[PDB]
Design a protein around this ligand. Structure first.
Ligand code: ILE
Ligand code: ILE
Ligand code: FE2
Ligand code: FE2
Lengths: 370, 370
């Protein structure tokens, strides 16, 4: 494979520059990196690689990767290649991948438009092979810039893999039989479709509401708040799938099943020893739905109530009433009221100032090794 | 086995009361539990089970498990049986185990005396089989009480298993050759003895210094501070192994290697996606030692410097100077100075108010799957 020989060159340069992360913005390093890229027999020929060489050589006066991102954002081809510095994707340094796009419902694409690119990774350098790396954001490039129209990638194949390895097992063990009938025995192409719908709705709704991100990003980074924000947009996504009549009914219900099953199960068990931000918000959802009649527990198995759509609407309405007070109070006051809401429905240790997995999911973690 | 039949009866009773934790102190529930225990053909005739039945039947007027704890503390036999509620050991409800005691050095038990019981679990009910449950504390019983002379159990067999599963392959991959010569190929009984020394020195030092626990426990539960407290007592134990000449020199050096390798390696990688309390403090140690001449990184491998004992002393002295100010400043002010120290040497995200694995150990987690 030619792409395979390109990636081998990237992987080899990546190996040499590991341990040089502190000089990734030093111009002496960058000139040598650029020269090594340009002199690479297969990689140096690539248009995206010429864009990076030009960007890197100019960095001392323009610390931006403008040529690379122009190439990527215009989809001049299906290759991504750059120098990355993402604190939460530590595996990424000099990296290369090729992707394939997914079929898109046209109403979805127009009414809920965002710069989202749900894609499958076809081939990639080693950093992109880490299971941690599920997406790629514009500020992950060394320049750290994000503009509102930069493309954001989500790697759907990694979400299909997680759903196969964790969510299916959890559906069988934790849900009442018949709970997610469209997802039962679905093939990868079908989960791929739902997951792509999920990410499209997800990104769109992050930018909606009274405290959208990135505008209010620095108020939504505390663990319970970062998770609550993910949950806000995913419940918004569930409700769109339930209520927007211009979406094909069978595809919309499948996407609904996917978002609900991921949030009620896979995300609810993330993090060892303590829940991560997603798990805290999923356990908030779990306890809120149990207490307000959206789900029932019968012998430790979850029943989805017929009334669940109304209880989801009530839950999103409640988040929105808290966020709406941004117009009459401070962001810091809204934060405390989001924390108070969260802590009513989660296992918050006030001395540690952190969270424990609620007993229902602690036992599932023990029983299934998730 | 008769004990096999006793444990089978406990596991079945545990199964019936799962999902009744909200009732574990309701006398109607306790009366019924007590009757089922007393009627168990094998379990009900055990002396410790006689004791539990008696404590549970009296719980409405005396919410204590005094008879059970008298049996256990007096070591009337090597069986433990009770009703537990420990939020960090969620698998424990009604549980039974038998243990065996370990050889003990006389000087160690006299000079560094504490109610520590380093033991091996021989047989146990299901709750005690979780890898989370590494110890048993007196306040873990449903009465929530701990007294200074109550026995505290550490399950050394689980620390041997963790050493062989994680620490050993980390030593091979991350330490310069010859770093831990006494541990190389050491058998399980040898690691057992080193671990039992670790726990004895550990519990002893928790009770020494200017902010001992449990007196100052509620000030040391924030993630970085709970880790730093575990690290304070383990550095103290390392130094005792190096410095106290009345300890047998072979066993002392072996314990030193065990404590250092555990804190430099196994504890340094704990927690996904973020470091737990132990890992934050271990990363503090790693960066402190790197910056102050106690270890060096050559080829991505850790070299223990000959000067390391002096740098460990400097590190413990530093902690002790921060804690000593409890005599002239508030406990809250000491907390802020312990945090400030920690954050100088770890990857602290001030907007999330949490920690990320430093890149050195993030790469090891990816490489070795730990
Ligand atoms: C695919 C979702 C990713 C990880 C992130 N939650 C986002 O909003 O892009
Ligand atoms: C075995 C040690 C346990 C986990 C705890 N750190 C203690 O000091 O009791
Ligand atoms: Fe998101
Ligand atoms: Fe401890």
């Amino acid at each position: 494979s030619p792409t395979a020989a390109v990636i081998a060159e990237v992987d080899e340069l990546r190996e040499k520059i590991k341990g040089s992360r502190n000089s990734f913005r030093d111009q002496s390093f960058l000139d040598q990196l650029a020269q090594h890229i340009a002199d690479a027999p297969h990689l140096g020929r690539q248009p995206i690689a010429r864009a990076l060489v030009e960007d890197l050589r100019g960095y001392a006066s323009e610390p931006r990767l403008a040529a690379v991102k122009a190439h990527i954002n215009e989809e001049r081809d299906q290759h991504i290649f750059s120098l990355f510095d993402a604190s939460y994707f530590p595996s990424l340094s000099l990296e290369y991948l090729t992707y394939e796009t997914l079929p898109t419902n046209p109403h979805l694409a127009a009414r809920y438009a965002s710069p989202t690119m749900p894609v499958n990774i076809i081939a990639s350098s080693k950093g992109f092979q880490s299971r941690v790396v599920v997406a790629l954001f514009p500020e992950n490039h060394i320049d750290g810039i994000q503009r509102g129209d930069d493309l954001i990638f989500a790697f759907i194949n990694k979400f299909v893999e997680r759903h196969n390895r964790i969510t299916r097992k959890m559906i069988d063990a934790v849900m009442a039989e018949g709970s997610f009938p469209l997802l039962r025995g679905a093939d990868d192409r079908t989960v791929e479709q739902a997951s792509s719908w999920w990410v499209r709705l997800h990104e769109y709704h992050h930018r909606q509401g009274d405290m959208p991100i990135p505008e209010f990003l620095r108020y939504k980074k505390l663990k319970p708040l970062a998770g609550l924000e993910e949950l806000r947009v995913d419940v918004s996504g569930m409700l769109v799938c339930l209520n927007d009549p211009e979406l094909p009914a069978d595809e919309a219900r499948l996407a609904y099943e996917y978002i609900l099953s991921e949030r009620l199960l896979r995300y609810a068990v993330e993090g060892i020893p303590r829940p991560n931000y997603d798990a805290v918000a999923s356990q908030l959802l779990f306890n809120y739905l149990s207490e307000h009649g959206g789900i029932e527990l019968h012998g430790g198995v979850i029943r989805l109530c017929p009334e669940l759509p109304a209880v989801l609407t009530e839950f999103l309405d409640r988040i929105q009433r808290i966020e709406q007070r941004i117009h009459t109070t401070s962001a810091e006051e809204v934060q405390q009221n989001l924390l108070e809401f969260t802590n009513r429905y989660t296992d918050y240790d006030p001395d540690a100032k952190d969270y424990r997995h609620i007993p229902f999911f602690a036992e599932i973690k023990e029983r299934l090794g998730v």
